[PDB]
Symmetry: C2
Subunit: 227 residues, 2 copies
């Protein structure tokens, strides 16, 4: 009756806030906005890597399989954080407490289309009243369900998927008796997340090719393990 | 105990086979392969449009909303048919009984990457022993869950999603007692379907821009309602 332990565990494993810290000495521009976002993402990747070790069974995978899951899922995980932070806002994306993008800024950054897609995810989760418990569980499921082409132990990854799916099912059965299909509805949000991540990875890859925006080692590694 | 009526209904509503009929007088080439595929897809679209009228509640949506769902989901529906037809094959895609693509042909057609992604869907469904009942229900769910930006009656579309989700849940609960999470596992295949469809739409859009492959009215309309 006191709810699911895996969900409780993921809640306490939740990383602290990360600040974007756009350089206050640099003139606003698309380059500044993109540089800021890519730097924030690089720092987020470090946090995500440390966070995944808390997911039951994740650290028992081969390092290769751990890396493969992370390389496929990192942008989904990043986007779901932006989405969750943005739930109490209207038509704005909280990339960080110090970096909230409205429509104007998205246009300036050349991110209007991508940010509108992320706002589509926000709209859906607002309607469903997405809870923190559900957000953290979905991040874990997106990691485990990321469909990497390169998995060594397919059955172990399948087992990780099942443990987290069970946690979602159990949590919903206990907390949301009014909707016996809420777990499934949650899983049904994952395609739009996958779609949006693919849009983001393609976009930032184009930016990587244009060569005008500085990018760090880890972010580049993740971007280049491509899709 | 005799299983779910919506599933039974979708089974009987299943369209007949469509032949690719590659032109036997035309030399094999990438242009011939792509022309054949786009023509087959055009004919499939007609079939899909007629099929959707059988889905409970679909014909009660506004024509605009019917069109919006179809415009977002058509490639997913097309791909899931190719996937299902290919379940009893190895490393080959049954686009049609008279058009089965192996790795060599995919390379010739410039479709290696896309076809490998579709084969990834096949691999997963083979492992899960996807049934015809499950395939038809997933096609319907992909239609209803297609995340069109343009929906007028959001609540009616949500209701359609719930009716079909319930059907999947009920079918799995009755037919697959050995795995109380099989419905969820089925829903968890949808992100890779979304991902693969996006890859296909982008690819054929590039082909549309190159202007070398003839394309028909309906296919062009669907391709251009873009993504």
């Amino acid at each position: 009756k006191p709810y699911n332990k895996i969900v409780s565990h993921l809640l306490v494993a939740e990383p602290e806030k990360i600040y974007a810290m756009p350089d206050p000495t640099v003139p606003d521009s698309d380059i500044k906005a993109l540089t800021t976002l890519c730097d924030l993402a690089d720092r987020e990747l470090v946090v995500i890597i440390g966070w995944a070790k808390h997911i039951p069974g994740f650290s028992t995978l081969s390092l290769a399989d751990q890396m493969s899951l992370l390389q496929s899922a990192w942008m989904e995980i990043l986007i779901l954080g932006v989405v969750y932070r943005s739930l109490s806002f209207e038509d704005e994306l909280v990339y960080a407490d110090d970096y909230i993008m409205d429509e104007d800024q998205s246009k300036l950054a050349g991110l209007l289309d991508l940010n509108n897609a992320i706002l589509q995810l926000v709209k859906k989760y607002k309607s469903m009243k997405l809870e923190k418990e559900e957000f953290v569980t979905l991040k874990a499921i997106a990691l485990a369900n990321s469909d990497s082409m390169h998995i060594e132990d397919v059955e172990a990854v399948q087992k990780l998927q099942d443990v987290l799916h069970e946690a979602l099912q159990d949590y919903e059965a206990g907390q949301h008796m009014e909707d016996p299909r809420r777990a499934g509805k949650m899983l049904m949000t994952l395609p739009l997340l996958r779609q949006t991540s693919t849009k983001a990875v393609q976009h930032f890859y184009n930016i990587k090719l244009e060569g005008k925006v500085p990018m760090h080692k880890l972010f580049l590694e993740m971007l280049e393990a491509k899709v």
